[PDB]
């Protein structure tokens, strides 16, 4: 059922938070601290910021109708990173390693 795939989405997000991915996952745990980093143009270029904490809140508040809507937010998080940053930047390399974890689990969902 729809509520079985949303249970898997929780498991996928929990995995993305787990210790074994912590070295490359941490930049996506919470909203980009644009204040502290002095990224004055970030909110102008990124219209819909997204992060794993915001996704966790939305998932616990059952604001995702299906896995596809959860998926769109995970991919928005990564797209925001790929959009703002050059391809050589360390955060892009970290995004890709975490996205690979997401894409494999998301694809193998029953
Ligand atoms: C100095 C921060 C930064 N500067 C850039 C640019 C550098 C350059 C000028 C202009 C346009 C550029 C080309 C991208 C800004 N991008 C970032 C950037 C983008 C990020 C991003 O998309 N995500 C998802 C996370 C981070 C980020 C966030 C944080 C906290 C404070 C926890 O919010 C710390 C460090 C971050 O990014 C870095 C990272 C992940 C690894 C690294 F080695 C250095 C970072 C600055 C960043 O930092």
UniProtKB/Swiss-Prot annotation:
Subunit structure: Interacts with p53/TP53; the interaction is direct. Interacts (via CTD region) with CDK9 and CCNT1, acting as an associated component of P-TEFb complex. Interacts with RELA (when acetylated at 'Lys-310'). Interacts (via NET domain) with NSD3, CHD4, BICRA and ATAD5. The interaction with BICRA bridges BRD4 to the GBAF complex. Interacts (via NET domain) with JMJD6 (via JmjC and N-terminal domains); the interaction is stronger in presence of ssRNA and recruits JMJD6 on distal enhancers. Interacts with NSD3. Interacts with NIPBL. (Microbial infection) Interacts with bovine papillomavirus type 1 regulatory protein E2. This interactions may serve for the tethering of viral genomes to host mitotic chromosomes allowing successful partitioning of the viral genome during cell division.
Subcellular location: Nucleus; Chromosome
PTM annotation: Phosphorylation by CK2 disrupt the intramolecular binding between the bromo domain 2 and the NPS region and promotes binding between the NPS and the BID regions, leading to activate the protein and promote binding to acetylated histones. In absence of phosphorylation, BRD4 does not localize to p53/TP53 target gene promoters, phosphorylation promoting recruitment to p53/TP53 target promoters.
Record's disease association: Cornelia de Lange syndrome 6: A form of Cornelia de Lange syndrome, a clinically heterogeneous developmental disorder associated with malformations affecting multiple systems. It is characterized by facial dysmorphisms, abnormal hands and feet, growth delay, cognitive retardation, hirsutism, gastroesophageal dysfunction and cardiac, ophthalmologic and genitourinary anomalies. CDLS6 inheritance is autosomal dominant.
Site (Acetylated histone binding): 85
Known outcome of mutating residue 82 to C: In CDLS6; likely pathogenic; reduced acetylated histone binding
Name of this protein: Bromodomain-containing protein 4
Role, per record: Chromatin reader protein that recognizes and binds acetylated histones and plays a key role in transmission of epigenetic memory across cell divisions and transcription regulation. Remains associated with acetylated chromatin throughout the entire cell cycle and provides epigenetic memory for postmitotic G1 gene transcription by preserving acetylated chromatin status and maintaining high-order chromatin structure. During interphase, plays a key role in regulating the transcription of signal-inducible genes by associating with the P-TEFb complex and recruiting it to promoters.
Domain of life per record: Eukaryota
Family that this chain belongs to: Belongs to the BET family.
Domain Bromo span(s) in chain numbering: 1-109
Domain notes: The NET domain mediates interaction with a number of chromatin proteins involved in transcription regulation (NSD3, JMJD6, CHD4, GLTSCR1 and ATAD5).
Organism: Homo sapiens
Record's miscellaneous remark: JQ1, a thieno-triazolo-1,4-diazepine derivative, and I-BET, a benzodiazepine derivative, have been tested on tumors with success. Treatment with GSK1210151A (I-BET151, a I-BET derivative) has strong effets on mixed lineage leukemia and promotes myeloid differentiation and leukemia stem-cell depletion.
């Amino acid at each position: 059922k729809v509520s079985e795939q949303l249970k898997c989405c929780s498991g996928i997000l929990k995995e993305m938070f787990a210790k074994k991915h912590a070295a490359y996952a941490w930049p996506f745990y919470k909203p980009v601290d644009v204040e502290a980093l002095g990224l004055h143009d970030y909110c102008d270029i990124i219209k819909h910021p997204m992060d794993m904490s915001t996704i966790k809140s939305k998932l616990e508040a059952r604001e995702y109708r299906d896995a596809q809507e959860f998926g769109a937010d995970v991919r928005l998080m990564f797209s925001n990173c790929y959009k703002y940053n050059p391809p050589d930047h360390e955060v892009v390399a970290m995004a890709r390693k975490l996205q690979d974890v997401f894409e494999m689990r998301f694809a193998k969902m029953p």
